[PDB]
């Protein structure tokens, strides 16, 4: 049949072929000898120019003016800018197109049905840590919108030759502190012990709770990072309660409303935006299963199982499974009660299947990372578990980058 990967849905028996992978210009980690699909982690005017031309071609194709006079003029304008300056700059409309395409192209994101609705904030005129903080606060206010969350990304100046990078040191705009204890344990979020100590080293006076919002460490080019505390009024949080287990509220658990990844690099046409925080809204399992139940995170499974009086002495009682379902239900219930946007894993995966169908028609495929798209609880109860997926790298893209310290 067709000389492209054949992809099957085992629940429905349907088949599609992915032709979009032909547009990939970057290799992944796999080879015919071994699959590394489950691993978490993966300028010369010569390569920059090829990447820029490819992106300009993508942009002109998107506005249906491929091969037009304007297309050819833009291409020559980029070559001349690179020729004399070693780099180039994107037009406003090109940046918007690029950021939306990077989201659309993200294999690990199950929320891509929303890709065309992204609000892109242009902050390429930023020149200091203080101004970065103002842009970030504005992003947070706009995105949170008192609970009716709106997808958004704020783009700071791109990396420049011979000049330091703009960087947000925090992994997310909102994260809880993790305090290493005398006995070696951690009060708060164990995932954030390093960033927490860095904040302390930079003058932050730490709290002592389990849910203390961390300050931001913002770095303008060639300067030590500066510390900024987020005004509490801007950080929306949701106290957690359960619809039928009245004692759940007594555990004093809570989570923040805005998921805002802030340490990824946005690559568009060879240009690199080292600081471009983006945010959408939470899928409930992110909080209920991973943040609260991972053994290396808050690890609350046993505490909740004990309150439910389950037999935590043996695996066959499925106490972990029962407690996790209740915790996830509490997260959903609590956000709904607080009128804060959130999506359950069944609804998110159903919407992602719709996205796959949309993209099959629009582009001939959709890069997706099965291990990340299938939720952490109830995997086979969702439609995505039964859908084969092809994973490849397309640009524009969001990519991991080394920590700045």
Ligand X SMILES: N=C(NCCC[C@H](N)C(=O)N[C@H]1CN[C@H](C(N)=O)C1)N[N+](=O)[O-]
Residues lying near ligand X in the complex (CB under 6 A): 111, 259, 261, 278-283, 286
The single residue listed with the structure tokens 């978490």 is 40
CB atoms within 10 A of CB 295: 9
* Strands 178-180 and 186-188, bridge-based pairing: antiparallel
Q: Tell me the per-residue interface mask from 284 to 323 with ligand H4B, x by CB under 6 A, - otherwise.
A: ----------------------------------------
Residue 110 is a binding residue for ligand HEM (CB under 6 A): yes
Residue 47 is a binding residue for a copy of itself (CB under 8 A): no
Residue 273's H or E segment, with its range, is: strand 271-273
CA 333 to chain CA centroid, Å, is 23
Longest dimension (CA), the chain: 73
Q: Tell me the per-residue interface mask from 357 to 386 with a copy of itself, x by CB under 8 A, - otherwise.
A: ------------xxx--xxxxxxxx---xx
Residues in region 286-345 near a copy of itself by CB under 8 A = 289-290, 293-296, 301, 315-318, 320-322, 324-325, 328-329, 332, 336, 344
Min CB(95)–ligand HEM separation in Å:
12
The single residue listed with the structure tokens 């406003």 is 92
Q: Residue 12: which residues within 8 A CB-CB, separation 6 or more?
A: 386
Residue 93 is a binding residue for a copy of itself (CB under 8 A): no
Residue 122's H or E segment, with its range, is: strand 119-122
Instruction: Give the active site residues.
Output: 109, 112, 281, 286
- Asked whether the beta carbons of 103 and 120 are under 8 A apart, the reply is no
Report the residue closest to ligand H4B, judged by CB.
372
Contact partner, 385, from ligand X, ligand HEM, ligand H4B, none, Cβ < 5-8 Å per class: ligand H4B
Residues in region 250-289 near a copy of itself by CB under 8 A = 289
Residue 387: strand pairing partners: 9
Min CB(239)–ligand HEM separation in Å:
22
Min CB(68)–ligand X separation in Å:
35
- DSSP assignment letter at 17: E
């Amino acid at each position: 049949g067709p000389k492209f990967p054949r992809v099957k849905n085992w629940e429905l028996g349907s088949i599609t072929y992915d032709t979009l992978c032909a547009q990939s210009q970057q290799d992944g980690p796999c080879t015919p000898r071994r699959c590394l699909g489950s691993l978490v982690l993966p300028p010369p005017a010569e390569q920059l120019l090829s990447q820029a031309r490819d992106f300009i071609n993508q942009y002109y194709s998107s506005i249906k003016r491929s091969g037009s006079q304007a297309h050819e003029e833009r291409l020559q304008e980029v070559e001349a800018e690179v020729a004399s300056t070693g780099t180039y700059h994107l037009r406003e409309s090109e940046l918007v197109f690029g950021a939306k395409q990077a989201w659309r192209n993200a294999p690990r994101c199950v929320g891509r049905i929303q890709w065309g609705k992204l609000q892109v904030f242009d902050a390429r005129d930023c020149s200091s840590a203080q101004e970065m903080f103002t842009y970030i606060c504005n992003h947070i206010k706009y995105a949170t919108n008192r609970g009716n969350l709106r997808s958004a990304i704020t783009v700071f100046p791109q990396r420049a030759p011979g000049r330091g990078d703009f960087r947000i040191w925090n992994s997310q705009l909102v994260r809880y502190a993790g305090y290493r204890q005398q006995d070696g344990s951690v009060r708060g979020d164990p995932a954030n012990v390093e960033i927490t100590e860095l904040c302390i080293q930079h003058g932050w006076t730490p709290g002592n709770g389990r849910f203390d919002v961390l300050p931001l460490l913002l770095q303008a080019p060639d300067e030590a990072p500066e510390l900024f505390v987020l005004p509490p009024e801007l950080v929306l949080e949701v106290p957690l309660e359960h619809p039928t287990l009245e004692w759940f509220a007594a555990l004093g658990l809570r989570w923040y409303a805005l998921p805002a990844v802030s340490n990824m690099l946005l690559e568009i046409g060879g240009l690199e935006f080292s600081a471009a925080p983006f945010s959408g809204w939470y899928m409930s399992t992110e909080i209920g299963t991973r943040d609260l139940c991972d053994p290396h995170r808050y690890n609350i499974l046993e505490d909740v199982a004990v309150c439910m009086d389950l037999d935590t002495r043996t695996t066959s009682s499925l106490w972990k499974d029962k407690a996790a379902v209740e915790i996830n239900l509490a997260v959903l219930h609590s956000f709904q009660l607080a009128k804060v946007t959130i999506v359950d894993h069944h609804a998110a995966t159903v919407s992602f299947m719709k996205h796959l169908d949309n993209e099959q028609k629009a582009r001939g495929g959709c890069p997706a990372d099965w291990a990340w798209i299938v939720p952490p609880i109830s995997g086979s109860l969702t439609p995505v578990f039964h859908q084969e997926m092809v994973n490849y790298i397309l640009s524009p893209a969001f990519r991991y980058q080394p920590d700045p310290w």
